Design a protein around this ligand. Structure first.
Ligand SMILES: [Mg+2]
Length: 395
């Protein structure tokens, strides 16, 4: 009868508060549900128009941006890298030209520069356009502040990234407290870096994802880099979330004549976007029938980068037709998995003078997994279904 009564009394005050607030929360839930159901009736009717989900549903996972998240890294077999080693590597070789114009050009980084003698650290040191480089830009965010922990991993090795301090992430209108990703280098990757190392730049904002690279400053024929991504999201009580058809966006699945970006080995259900270059074929999600790099070339409708033409620059976060290189995966359960990578076209499709040339590519990729579904007008669930308050019983 000690803190039993004090607990009961605390829970009674909280009950009284929830009872007072419950009718307004129920009203707001009911109004939002009504809105969502009407938006879904229209999406069903429009399911074959350009940029619409072939199987429309509401987005329960609000997971667009987390600029203020906090990053923690652990690897049992890998090497977390000192910032100053990462900085030195950026200043030399193929990224030097951009580093001298105050730009961190992640896709030009020659990762051999990271393989120095006394490089290891026990905890994450963030690097990016921050501190003394607060006026610098990066090719991934331009002027926006981006930073990452750096790790060297070989085939089969993994890093576990924990992201806390999340300000805007919600599932079914409840706040997400923590996200844990385990990133593993897929053993079947074909990259040639003699050390066997891959650099993962793990951004502090988990919605920006990962920059994965084995680039040594030359292109490679018959190369690939794949990163397995296993993840669990956690609720306000630090418990794993059991997703029920949350939508995961797989965007920027670029296909050029020599290079395919693809997702594979995924949990959940692929949902095609109407009009998109992206489909599923043999458990792999990519541009299956056409290239998507340049209008007219290899069957592509649009041009991936902004050139001036109509619907060009499809490949960015804010472009209206970014769905052209996107798909969605409907996920459930508490533990989910997907593998993202880039591979030489000739390892995937028959050799062909337009669709699959032998020309070498850079074994790198920037990918992201988030809730920013690129299909048009997908409604978000922002209001929780309130649980009727239960009056507690006295000791
Ligand atoms: Mg891409």
């Amino acid at each position: 009868y000690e803190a039993k009564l004090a607990k009961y009394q605390a829970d009674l005050a909280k009950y009284q508060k929830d009872l007072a607030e419950y009718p307004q929360k129920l009203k707001e839930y009911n109004e939002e549900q009504a809105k969502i159901k009407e938006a879904l009736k229209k999406l069903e009717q429009d399911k074959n128009k350009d940029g619409h989900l072939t199987e429309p549903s509401a987005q329960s996972l609000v997971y667009d941006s987390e600029p203020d998240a906090k990053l923690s890294l652990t690897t049992e077999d890998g090497t977390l890298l000192k910032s100053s080693v990462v900085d030195e590597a950026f200043s030399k070789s193929t990224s030097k030209a951009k580093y001298d114009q105050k730009i961190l050009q992640l896709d030009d980084l020659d990762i051999r520069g990271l393989e120095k003698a006394d490089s290891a650290t026990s905890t994450v040191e963030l690097y990016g356009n921050i501190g003394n480089k607060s006026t610098w830009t990066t090719n991934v965010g331009n002027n926006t502040e981006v930073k990452w922990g750096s790790v060297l991993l070989k085939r089969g090795q993994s890093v576990t990234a924990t992201y806390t301090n999340l300000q805007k992430t919600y599932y079914n209108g409840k706040k997400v407290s923590k996200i844990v990703y385990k990133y593993t280098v897929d053993k079947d990757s074909k990259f040639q870096n003699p050390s066997g190392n891959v650099w993962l730049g793990v951004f502090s904002d988990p919605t920006l994802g990962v920059f994965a690279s084995a680039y040594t400053g030359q292109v490679e024929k018959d190369t690939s880099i794949f990163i397995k991504n296993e993840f669990t999201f956690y609720d306000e009580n630090d418990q794993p979330i059991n997703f029920d058809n949350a939508l995961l966006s797989v965007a920027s699945l670029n296909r050029e004549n020599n290079s395919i970006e693809m997702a594979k080995d995924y949990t959940g259900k692929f949902v095609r976007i109407s009009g998109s270059s992206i489909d599923e074929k043999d458990g792999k999600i990519y541009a299956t029938k056409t290239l998507n790099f340049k209008k007219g070339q290899g069957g592509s409708r649009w041009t991936m980068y902004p050139n001036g033409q109509e619907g060009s620059g499809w490949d960015s976060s804010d472009a209206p037709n970014s769905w052209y290189g996107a798909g969605a995966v409907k996920i459930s359960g508490q533990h989910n998995s997907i593998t993202l990578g880039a591979i030489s076209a000739t390892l995937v499709v028959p050799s062909d003078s337009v669709m699959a040339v032998e020309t070498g590519k850079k074994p790198n990729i920037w990918y992201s997994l988030n809730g920013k579904i690129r299909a048009v007008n997908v409604p978000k669930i922002t209001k929780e279904n309130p649980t009727p308050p239960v009056e507690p019983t006295a000791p």
